[PDB]
Design an enzyme around this catalytic site. Sequence first.
Site, short mmCIF file in Angstrom:
data_model
loop_
_atom_site.label_atom_id
_atom_site.label_comp_id
_atom_site.label_asym_id
_atom_site.label_seq_id
_atom_site.Cartn_x
_atom_site.Cartn_y
_atom_site.Cartn_z
CE1 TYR A 45 1.28 -0.26 4.40
CE2 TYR A 45 0.65 2.03 4.14
CZ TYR A 45 1.33 1.05 4.85
OH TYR A 45 2.04 1.40 6.00
CG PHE A 55 3.21 11.29 1.21
CD1 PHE A 55 2.17 11.19 0.26
CD2 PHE A 55 3.75 12.55 1.50
CE1 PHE A 55 1.75 12.33 -0.44
CE2 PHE A 55 3.30 13.70 0.84
CZ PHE A 55 2.30 13.59 -0.13
CG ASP A 56 2.98 4.54 5.74
OD1 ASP A 56 4.16 4.24 5.85
OD2 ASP A 56 2.03 3.81 5.95
CB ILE A 75 -7.96 2.65 10.45
CG1 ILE A 75 -7.56 2.49 8.96
CG2 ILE A 75 -6.98 3.47 11.28
CD1 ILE A 75 -7.49 3.80 8.22
CE1 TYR A 101 -4.80 5.73 13.38
CE2 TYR A 101 -5.05 6.54 11.16
CZ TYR A 101 -4.50 5.62 12.03
OH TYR A 101 -3.65 4.68 11.54
CG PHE A 118 -4.79 3.90 2.59
CD1 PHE A 118 -5.81 4.38 3.39
CD2 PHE A 118 -3.57 3.64 3.19
CE1 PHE A 118 -5.57 4.69 4.72
CE2 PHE A 118 -3.34 4.02 4.48
CZ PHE A 118 -4.32 4.48 5.26
C1 LIG Z 1 -1.02 6.44 13.22
O1 LIG Z 1 0.28 5.97 12.90
C2 LIG Z 1 0.57 5.48 11.66
C3 LIG Z 1 -0.26 5.55 10.54
C4 LIG Z 1 0.17 5.05 9.32
C5 LIG Z 1 1.40 4.44 9.21
C6 LIG Z 1 2.12 4.23 10.38
C7 LIG Z 1 1.78 4.82 11.58
O2 LIG Z 1 2.61 4.67 12.68
C8 LIG Z 1 2.17 3.71 13.60
O3 LIG Z 1 3.39 3.82 10.40
C9 LIG Z 1 3.96 2.83 9.53
C10 LIG Z 1 3.82 1.66 10.47
C11 LIG Z 1 5.08 0.93 10.68
O4 LIG Z 1 6.16 1.83 10.43
O5 LIG Z 1 2.74 1.00 9.82
C12 LIG Z 1 2.17 -0.07 10.40
C13 LIG Z 1 0.69 0.01 10.33
C14 LIG Z 1 0.14 0.42 11.45
C15 LIG Z 1 -1.29 0.32 11.82
C16 LIG Z 1 -0.87 -0.35 13.20
C17 LIG Z 1 -2.16 1.59 11.91
C18 LIG Z 1 -1.56 2.64 12.87
O6 LIG Z 1 -2.18 2.17 10.57
C19 LIG Z 1 -3.33 1.91 9.94
O7 LIG Z 1 -4.26 1.34 10.40
C20 LIG Z 1 -3.40 2.50 8.54
C21 LIG Z 1 -3.86 1.39 7.60
C22 LIG Z 1 -2.76 0.40 7.40
C23 LIG Z 1 -1.52 1.07 6.92
C24 LIG Z 1 -1.05 2.18 7.82
N1 LIG Z 1 -2.13 3.12 8.16
C25 LIG Z 1 -2.04 4.46 8.37
O8 LIG Z 1 -2.96 5.08 8.92
C26 LIG Z 1 -0.74 5.18 8.10
C27 LIG Z 1 -0.96 6.65 7.77
C28 LIG Z 1 -1.73 6.81 6.45
C29 LIG Z 1 -1.92 8.23 6.21
C30 LIG Z 1 -0.62 8.90 5.86
C31 LIG Z 1 0.08 8.90 7.20
C32 LIG Z 1 0.32 7.45 7.67
#
Ligand SMILES: COc1cc2cc(c1OC)OC[C@H](CO)OC/C=C/[C@@H](C)[C@@H](C)OC(=O)[C@@H]1CCCCN1C(=O)[C@H]2C1CCCCC1
Length: 128
Positions: A45, A55-56, A75, A101, A118
């Site tokens: 993703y 961005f991630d 999420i 969130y 995404f």
């Molecule tokens: C709120 O914090 C973050 C949000 C997001 C990425 C993320 C992060 O730090 C915890 O870091 C990358 C991390 C490992 O280095 O990824 C693992 C997936 C984490 C899951 C546990 C949760 C926190 O993330 C999600 O549920 C969603 C969906 C899956 C992919 C990650 N996503 C994010 O919300 C991204 C986020 C997307 C918007 C751009 C900023 C990052």
Amino acid sequence: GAPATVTEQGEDITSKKDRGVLKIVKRVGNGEETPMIGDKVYVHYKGKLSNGKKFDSSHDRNEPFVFSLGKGQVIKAWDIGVATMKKGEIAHLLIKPEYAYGSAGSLPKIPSNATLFFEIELLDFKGE
Ligand SMILES: COc1cc2cc(c1OC)OC[C@H](CO)OC/C=C/[C@@H](C)[C@@H](C)OC(=O)[C@@H]1CCCCN1C(=O)[C@H]2C1CCCCC1
């Protein structure tokens, strides 16, 4: 751009039909099965706040992201959205804060009441 196309053309995959999670299939997968609660799921993703800024991407860990579907380890919108996908599918999701969130957000990545976008590639899924 990609998010506007979703706003304008995407399908509302929520149960409440509140447009909180919209989806467009960008690449059709092969195979008919979409995964169930408890399945172990492998994706690539990229995500961003709908207005840029943060961005991630899985490709930034050079490795697929793996999680257990439907256990809220991600999420809500992912539990909802990834369940609608088939192996090999690529999808665009646009997500209101209520399926992400909320008002609390999550620093430093996520402001209050953020909309998220995404692109998700469903690589594979296995039973638990
Ligand atoms: C709120 O914090 C973050 C949000 C997001 C990425 C993320 C992060 O730090 C915890 O870091 C990358 C991390 C490992 O280095 O990824 C693992 C997936 C984490 C899951 C546990 C949760 C926190 O993330 C999600 O549920 C969603 C969906 C899956 C992919 C990650 N996503 C994010 O919300 C991204 C986020 C997307 C918007 C751009 C900023 C990052």
